[PDB]
Amino acid sequence: EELPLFYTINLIIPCLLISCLTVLVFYLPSECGEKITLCISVLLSLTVFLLLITEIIPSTSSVSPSIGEYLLFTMIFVTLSIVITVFVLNVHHRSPETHTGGGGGIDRIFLWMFIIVCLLGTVGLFLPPWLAGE
């Protein structure tokens, strides 16, 4: 009763700032400790925007919240991401197929994925008419 399309515009704005942010430090990591620095940064914002939503009270029902499904999906996604991204970069025991000539387009494709889920995920969640059935 007060969460129009705008709610998505205000949630998508930060979704990118926090997304690209993580990729930034991963692109040009000056210090080896910058990793943890970014992790804590996202937490502050995540907890900052979170409380805000609890102030407007978008849903005062018993259970089954509104954004509760979104904030959870993102937190869960970004979570497993930092886990795999850390391992994949921690060591490479196995490979997809290539062996020689590596380490060049992994950076460009890396950030390309984070943004690929941000848009795709958002759209797919909206469940448009063009992708509804026909």
Range of strand content: under 5%
Number of strands: 0
What do we call the CATH topology? Methane Monooxygenase Hydroxylase, Chain G, domain 1
Structural class: mainly alpha
The share of residues in helices is: 55-70%
By DSSP (H or I, 4+ residues per run), the number of helices equals 4
Instruction: Supply the CATH superfamily name.
Output: Neurotransmitter-gated ion-channel transmembrane domain
Note the main sheet.
none
Mass-distribution shape: globular
The helix-strand sequence is HHHH
Span between N and C termini? 30 Å
The radius of gyration computed from the alpha-carbon positions, rounded to a whole number of angstroms, is 18 Å
Task: Determine and state the CATH class.
Answer: Mainly Alpha
Number of structurally distinct domains: 1
Under the CATH scheme, the architecture is Up-down Bundle
Protein name: Neuronal acetylcholine receptor subunit alpha-4
Family: Belongs to the ligand-gated ion channel (TC 1.A.9) family. Acetylcholine receptor (TC 1.A.9.1) subfamily. Alpha-4/CHRNA4 sub-subfamily.
Transmembrane segments: 11-30, 36-52, 67-91, 109-127
Lipidation (S-palmitoyl cysteine): 32
Summarize, please:
With 134 residues, the chain is mainly α. It is built from four helices and no strands. The chain has a single domain (5-127), classed as Neurotransmitter-gated ion-channel transmembrane domain (Methane Monooxygenase Hydroxylase, Chain G, domain 1, Up-down Bundle).
